[PDB]
Design a protein around this ligand. Structure first.
Ligand code: HEM
Ligand code: HEM
Ligand SMILES: N=C(NCCC[C@H](N)C(=O)N(O)[C@H]1CN[C@H](C(N)=O)C1)N[N+](=O)[O-]
Ligand SMILES: N=C(NCCC[C@H](N)C(=O)N(O)[C@H]1CN[C@H](C(N)=O)C1)N[N+](=O)[O-]
Ligand SMILES: C[C@H](O)[C@H](O)[C@H]1CNc2nc(N)[nH]c(=O)c2N1
Ligand SMILES: C[C@H](O)[C@H](O)[C@H]1CNc2nc(N)[nH]c(=O)c2N1
Ligand SMILES: [Zn+2]
Lengths: 407, 411
């Protein structure tokens, strides 16, 4: 009932009760753990709304107040009629902040309460959506001094009027398959890079071509838009020692902005809710650059370093990986674009966990995602036991629109 | 109920049916995952059924399920159990059982070698001196002058729980740890408590940074006894770097034989409380954990300085840079001295092949992602991108409480 989690490097022991309020499933059973698997009605709605409102009023110290009871009845009535409801502004903001607060896979949640929320619920067209996104991108980039934000479009109604941003992130590089059979640019987007062309986008066919937004409003077919370039902050990648590094032709965008997730608050579903914070170095340096199925640039860099790539045991992949990541961090800093190294980010997460345990009674966390993709055990989270469970409001995965859209 | 796991780097999908045979608990529920938690006297009543499942698996493995030999064995064990409340395993069953405990070890990345285990049957052992003799032979056999061979030695099973055989050491070979009055620690911090017990038991500690600990052996539930492993039997490797000549000056070395000796081996319901086993090291165990854990030898800084890395701010990745070099050193030193060792790229690639093979030939392979993925360069090793299913099968290796916490001293 009252689970404890221990940190094996510092012996700190925290007790977890927050998990008792958990409501969603985890994919695991008492017979099998699926901790490493990537993707594990009016009657339905009111209970959800109630749990939320109750947690909402409890958060503002007005639990079981008239205001509390009143709104509960008000929403209660609204659902009974409209078979749905609308969140006050205060509720939309509390919900969004808490969905981030409950993202068990996010290592940067110590920043959760500073989220800037942009209410785009009055939006109606792909052009409108495009307007809101440009504003989000500009506000968040803030000339390199990034500020976390999320833009919330209209919630779901009948599922036949869903707003969706087809991109997986507001900003990503295109990927094209060549005659060579090889892939030019980012392989993970190869497909999307095609559905944009299956729409008319004139691809420059380069290594780092910023994709076009493909926005879908109220259910209609998506429309293409090109983000103003001066709004897309980019960082050329160089090394604080290897002058040859620049010759590699590497660069990345400064604003990470997940756009394909679904935000759930009080039972309400927001299918278009792009959000952004700022990068942890490793996301680019380790995953985007060195994943074999991504830009897969380990060999090249190893070559330039003239390393003995004859035997895995020389750890050339490892050496190169380190340099590369020193280069991503170095560049961003040099250009004054916000970025955090894995050591600093993981240290924050530990402090955040301690804060969350003593102020909220716990912190859902997914060890598999929290531990950085490099130097695992030299970061504190590696030695930190974590309990994973699902709390709401939350951010969830959802089918790619192009596998559900009735054109 | 079939379950699939996908590898996101190769899109290869596998189906798991083996998990259906799982009976033990994981520690998780439909509402919470405890996948990252370190540690999530049977009666006649519960014993025979456990014996049967095991004998059923054993006889199926040899293609004699339902034979007369199979039926008579069940009968023989059953009778023996009602007759003595317990039962003895045949040699073949023991070998089979030990191999499967290894094969079922979800946290082990080296399982591609499971079928080659050398099993030493020490069930006829009665005293600590006898235990010492078996262990010495295990260490010499397994070490094989640097060409390591996996092996396990199995002492008498538990009976009433008051006559347990136990090896008090956590590994047959480990370095002493000494807490100094100024609060600093000399040697391996991980073994401070055990080292104190040894000194208290009479060990004359040399108080250096790498003193091989004595064996503290308990036979038949009696008070444990100290023994020194013949030095000529303990293979060690001086650590040096293939480019940094000053590395050798750090005075680092490690033993070549990793031999866990505090786990409990369960087979057909029987419990073997003393079952030391050994294989060979994967570089990162020493390079990343033993040397760089803040709570172990903690050498990142000293190595960092020597390299003249910018240690002013973490974003210089000086820790990460030093880490790779130290791990290069460990691998280099072992290969030069021709002492078996495997890097994480190589070891993890083997595990993926082993895993695929297991799904196809056995219907699954329980695996703990949290432990399989190496402590450095996680995502550049294939296991990071590999989905895994963790569940408990027997025979198995289990944790058991430290004996100094449960032992009734006799004096
Ligand atoms: C401001 C600093 C932030 C940092 C440094 C940070 C860092 C990270 C990292 C390292 C991951 C894993 C990325 C991956 O491997 O794909 C992640 C995941 C995630 N973060 Fe954060 N984050 C931040 C802000 C945000 C914000 C503003 C939100 C939402 C409001 C958020 C929501 C999430 C979610 C839901 C995931 C998991 C997404 C998935 O399952 O793919 N993060 N974050
Ligand atoms: C052939 C060489 C082998 C390699 C390279 C290998 C490698 C490893 C590694 C890297 C771990 C994790 C250790 C840690 O982080 O503390 C591990 C765990 C484990 N291995 Fe193996 N292993 C091998 C042989 C064996 C053998 C012979 C057995 C038993 C017959 C075995 C049983 C286990 C068990 C039970 C665990 C988990 C122990 C625990 O939870 O503390 N391994 N192995
Ligand atoms: N720092 C942040 N990182 C999140 C987005 C960038 C990440 N590297 C990525 O490509 N992803 O998170 C995406 C690719 N794989 C993920 C999945 N579920 O399959 C989503 N966020 N943020 O600050 O708002
Ligand atoms: N290559 C092998 N490695 C296993 C033993 C060495 C390991 N580095 C270690 O110190 N440990 O596994 C011990 C310290 N931490 C573990 C724990 N549960 O707390 C036990 N095995 N083998 O070849 O048989
Ligand atoms: C199969 C495995 O779950 C998968 O590779 C996970 C592991 N941990 C991760 N952790 C983070 N932060 N991001 C990821 O994409 C992943 N991928
Ligand atoms: C808290 C966390 O479960 C713990 O530190 C685990 C993580 N993964 C590990 N993996 C291996 N191989 N060995 C370990 O000791 C650990 N420690
Ligand atoms: Zn689980």
């Amino acid at each position: 009932r009252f689970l404890k989690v221990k940190n094996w490097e510092t012996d700190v022991v925290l007790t977890d009760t927050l998990h008792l309020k958990s409501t969603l499933e985890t994919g695991c059973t008492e017979h099998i753990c699926m901790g490493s698997i990537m993707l594990p009605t009016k009657d339905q709605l009111f209970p959800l709304a109630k749990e939320f409102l109750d947690q909402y009023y409890s958060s503002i110290k007005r639990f079981g107040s008239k205001a509390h009871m009143d709104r509960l009845e008000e929403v209660n009535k609204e659902i009974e009629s409209t078979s749905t409801y609308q969140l006050k502004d205060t509720e939309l903001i509390y919900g969004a902040k808490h969905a981030w607060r409950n993202a068990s896979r996010c290592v940067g949640r110590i920043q959760w309460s500073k989220l800037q929320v942009f209410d785009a619920r009055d939006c109606t067209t792909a052009h409108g959506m495009f307007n809101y996104i440009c504003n989000h991108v500009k506000y968040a980039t803030n000339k390199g001094n990034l500020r976390s934000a999320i833009t919330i479009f209209p919630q779901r109604t009948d599922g036949k009027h869903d707003f969706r941003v087809w991109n997986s992130q507001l900003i990503r590089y295109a990927g094209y398959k060549q005659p060579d059979g090889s892939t030019l640019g980012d392989p993970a987007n190869v497909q999307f890079t095609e559905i944009c062309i299956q729409q008319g986008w004139k691809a420059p066919r380069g290594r780092f071509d910023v994709l076009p937004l493909l926005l879908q409003a109220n259910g209609n077919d998506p429309e293409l838009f090109q983000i103003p370039p001066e709004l897309v902050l980019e960082v050329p990648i160089r090394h604080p020692k290897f002058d040859w590094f620049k010759d590699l032709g590497l660069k990345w965008y400064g604003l990470p902005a997940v756009s394909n997730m679904l935000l759930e608050i009080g039972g309400l579903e927001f299918s278009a809710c792009p959000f952004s914070g700022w990068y942890m170095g490793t996301e680019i340096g380790v995953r985007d650059y060195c994943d074999n199925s991504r830009y897969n640039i380990l060999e090249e860099v190893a070559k330039k370093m003239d390393l003995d790539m004859r035997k895995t045991s020389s750890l050339w992949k490892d050496q190169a990986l380190v340099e590369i990541n020193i280069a991503v961090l170095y560049s961003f800093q040099s250009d004054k674009v916000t970025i955090v190294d894995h050591h600093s980010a993981t240290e924050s997460f530990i402090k955040h966990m301690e804060n969350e345990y003593r102020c909220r009674g716990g912190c859902p966390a997914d060890w598999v995602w929290i531990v950085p993709p490099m130097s695992g055990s030299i970061t504190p989270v590696f030695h930190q036991e974590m309990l994973n469970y699902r709390l709401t409001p939350s951010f969830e995965y959802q089918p790619d629109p192009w596998n559900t859209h009735v054109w």
